[PDB]
UniProtKB/Swiss-Prot annotation, chains A, B:
One of its GO terms (cellular component) is plasma membrane. Homodimer. It comes from Sphingobacterium multivorum. Its cofactor is pyridoxal 5'-phosphate. It comes from the Bacteria. Belongs to the class-II pyridoxal-phosphate-dependent aminotransferase family. Keywords: Acyltransferase, Cell inner membrane, Cell membrane, Cytoplasm, Lipid metabolism, Membrane, Pyridoxal phosphate, Transferase. This is Serine palmitoyltransferase. Disulfide bonds: none annotated. It is found in: Cytoplasm; Cell inner membrane. Pathway: Lipid metabolism; sphingolipid metabolism. It is a peripheral membrane protein. InterPro entries: Aminotrans_II_pyridoxalP_BS, Aminotransferase_I/II_large, AON_synthase_class-II, PyrdxlP-dep_Trfase, PyrdxlP-dep_Trfase_major, PyrdxlP-dep_Trfase_small.
Length: 392, 392
């Protein structure tokens, strides 16, 4: 019955107004492979709103391995890892990833989202606590909400607030601090050194979500712990295969006893079909490439440095970023939407960040770099962004 | 820090004891494609613990389309559907699925698990209520837990308890009843006719999870609503691509205004990378095949009927199943594990259902049929099950 249901959604009219005004730019139908340039409605558009940091989704070798996987293993495993969904290649990926981040064991999940849901939902129980950075990814908030523990949020990268909130908690109770390595919104890095110091001072477990760190920071792209050399102080390293690794899925690495507990207690892995053979081979090949070919990470950072400088010279107000995620502040929801659509019309694809995700004064567009980007593409994009910002 | 964390997992020793006793049979490493027969440790094993009801994961045509998708679109979209992750093929699948289940629109999710998380987390708010069948899939319990509404569980397929709990709720408040179409544990079907009668009597929204119904029941495999002809009384039809559809991912179909609300409010679709091109093409091809080739669904039911009869003649106590999921009761956790391992050693793969998922007296092994199974394979499996049940 749709009576009361109709009332609950009747209030949501932002999409309706966005479309009517001709400003709507969500769910854009791309007709070609994710690349530095994508075809939308038959026309070419520069892609600066991607998470494919190393531009590997088009690598013919990664594509080949995926196609080979399908030829040997089929289109899917038709079951969770727990039961009939485990393949030797899943196990191989887990050990390769374990060696990569320098941990004993690892467990894959169908998506990066479910990778956070698992550990956050079953490690901390009834009289325990989960400490979250207020800007943590949504999957982290949800995962913590799935637990039966008390979830406490602390100021963004505010160590004083972290220590303060931790010190109020009872001695006899477990605590788990969970943080993004590189935060997706402003592209900044977590203060791991101080967070871990506070953590092992109160004996709290530490989990880091490296969705945007893998293949970006750390030795050979190994992540945030690797970046700070704090591997030994991070209990759980979580990552995703949907960004630098050009695939779909995720993982959680840590000590053998903890991962074994995860494997058999996390609902997101026990009750969800395993990742497709194509994605496993895809992730394996990409991982190999990220390590054995330093040109990619190097290329990514050359584009990031070049674009960041180019943007600052044009007067743009960039956020406190320390990654390939360049947040260009706009400070107006309407203007942010307008800029996005106008750039889209001018062949430039950027991601908008608006309310209710952030207050109107903190609204911005996310400009993201890929290793495969060229100085020309960057110049063309920025050149058009100046023009559009002028018009607004 | 691992201090308090070590204490929380120290109590979990069932896996440890299972392995030491040589009874462990979880996460078995399959070395070949999911099929009626799978290679484990170099040896062949009959597969009766799969969700690939139509045995389509090995279909060369579905494999080909996936490989073609990869060739054209690459290994991944590197972003959520919300932003840069939408492809024309995603949109095509959504409209094809919409036509399939007879609904206006549809929105895909990266996994079937996240397909439940979306609608259950954002439709019913603060002063609203979600009614769940006590045996609903874990993803449904979690999705409801993600909402800010009051979650109320009712007796399994108990309509009196449903009506009773619904009647206690305030007039001015929304309600959403969510149920599995075909329940995975005992393989039974929800009493949709009476549930919907109670629903539109109290003006409650109805959502059905057809993970195990699609490609099994309903005209041409269209599902539970189709099965009962109650399409018009089901507000939301949710499904998965990881079982009959031989892939990975899921969807929620319904009215255009509701789905549009989902698209822009469900965190599991807004903050999670879209399904890989390979899986989208894979799902599209499988869907086409399920409809245009009735031999599969027919074959599945011939095997189900044959196996069910064969099992009842041998004296096995089957559950109240009405699907290809044949639950063979054992009523002993230890015996259930022992039977599973012994069958595994004898080349027969079955799934165990034990505590704490169900009380020890309700423990059983799930025997599942695939359209591609042969009468010989079924005979061989059952023949070995009789022997093993004897030994126990």
């Amino acid at each position: 019955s749709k009576g009361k249901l109709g009332e609950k959604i009747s209030q949501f009219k932002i999409v309706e107004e966005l479309k009517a005004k001709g400003l709507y730019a969500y769910f854009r139908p791309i007709q070609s492979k994710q690349d530095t340039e994508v075809k939308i409605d038959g026309r070419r558009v520069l892609m600066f709103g991607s998470n494919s940091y190393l531009g590997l989704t088009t690598d013919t070798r990664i594509i080949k391995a995926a196609q080979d996987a399908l030829e040997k293993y089929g289109t899917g495993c038709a079951g969770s890892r727990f039961l009939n969904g485990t393949l030797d290649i899943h196990v191989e990926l887990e050990e390769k990833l374990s060696a990569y981040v320098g941990k004993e064991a690892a467990i894959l999940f169908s998506t990066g989202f479910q990778s956070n849901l698992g550990p956050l939902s079953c490690l901390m129980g009834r009289n325990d606590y989960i400490l979250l950075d207020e800007r943590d990814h949504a999957s982290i908030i949800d995962g913590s909400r799935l637990s039966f523990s008390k979830v406490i949020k602390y100021g963004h990268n505010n160590m004083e607030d972290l220590r303060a909130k931790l010190s109020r908690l009872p001695e006899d109770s477990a605590k788990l601090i969970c943080t993004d390595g590189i935060f997706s919104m402003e592209g900044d890095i977590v203060n791991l050194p101080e967070l871990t110091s506070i953590a092992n001072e109160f004996d709290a477990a530490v989990m880091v979500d490296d969705a945007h760190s893998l293949g970006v920071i750390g030795h050979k792209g190994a992540g945030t712990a690797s970046h700070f050399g704090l591997n030994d102080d991070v209990d759980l390293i979580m990552g995703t295969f949907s960004k630098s690794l050009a695939s779909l899925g995720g993982f959680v690495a840590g000590d053998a006893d903890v991962i074994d507990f995860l494997k058999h207690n996390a609902r997101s892995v026990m009750f969800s079909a395993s990742m497709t053979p194509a994605s496993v081979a895809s992730t394996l090949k990409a991982l190999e490439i990220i390590q054995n070919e330093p040109e990619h990470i190097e290329k990514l950072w050359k584009n990031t440095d070049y674009a960041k400088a180019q943007l600052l010279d044009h007067g743009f107000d960039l956020g406190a970023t320390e990654s390939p995620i360049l947040p260009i502040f706009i400070r107006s929801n309407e203007k942010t939407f307008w800029v996005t659509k106008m750039l889209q019309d001018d062949g430039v694809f950027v991601n908008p960040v608006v309310s209710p995700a952030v207050p109107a004064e903190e609204s911005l567009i996310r400009f993201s770099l890929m290793a495969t980007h060229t100085y020309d593409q960057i110049d063309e994009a920025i050149e058009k962004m100046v023009k559009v910002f002028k018009q607004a």
